[PDB]
């Protein structure tokens, strides 16, 4: 993995608390969560970057991300 | 909160193939990363409430993933 372990656990925890108030997570279940989030974000960036490329650019802009999301189906 | 450190991001982006990054990608990546979790756990819980189970196993995530 590539995200730091501790600061990821805390985030999952805040959201998890939010829905539902009674809430408990397994140890590997959070591990599985992290490994997904990275895979996804790398998945995402490869797309994002190739919209940077499409624009004949090198630096990626949010506009690139946003496109890559509109085209898949991600809201917002 | 958003302790998703900027150089964490760069590691991934670069893993993606990214070669240069606008400064606003950080806030953006953060925003999406949240949303991804926000509604991948939202939908995992539901696979665990519907086995009337205490806590959420990895397995029920993998299930909540496949919907995505």
């Amino acid at each position: 993995l590539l995200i730091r372990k501790l600061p990821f656990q805390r985030l999952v925890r805040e959201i998890a608390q939010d829905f539902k108030t009674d809430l408990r997570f397994q140890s590997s279940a959070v591990m599985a969560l992290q490994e997904a989030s990275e895979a996804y974000l790398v998945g995402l960036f490869e797309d994002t970057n190739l919209c940077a490329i499409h624009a004949k650019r090198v630096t990626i802009m949010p506009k690139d991300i946003q496109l890559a999301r509109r085209i898949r189906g991600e809201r917002a | 909160i958003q302790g998703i450190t900027k150089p964490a991001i760069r590691r991934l982006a670069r893993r993606g193939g990214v070669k240069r990054i606008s400064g606003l990608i950080y806030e953006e990546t953060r925003g999406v990363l949240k949303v991804f979790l926000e509604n991948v756990i939202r939908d995992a819980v539901t696979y665990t409430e519907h086995a009337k189970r205490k806590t959420v196993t990895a397995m029920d995530v993998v299930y909540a993933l496949k919907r995505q």
């Binding site: 490994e35 997904a36 998945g43 | 993998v62 993933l65």
Partner: peptide, 22 residues
């Protein structure tokens, strides 16, 4: 038959696969 293999115990390899990842 020697045609069944052997493990490593990592399930993550499936998530890597859900999104496509080295």
């Amino acid at each position: 038959i020697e045609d069944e293999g052997e493990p490593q115990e990592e399930i993550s390899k499936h998530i890597r696969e859900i999104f496509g990842y080295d």
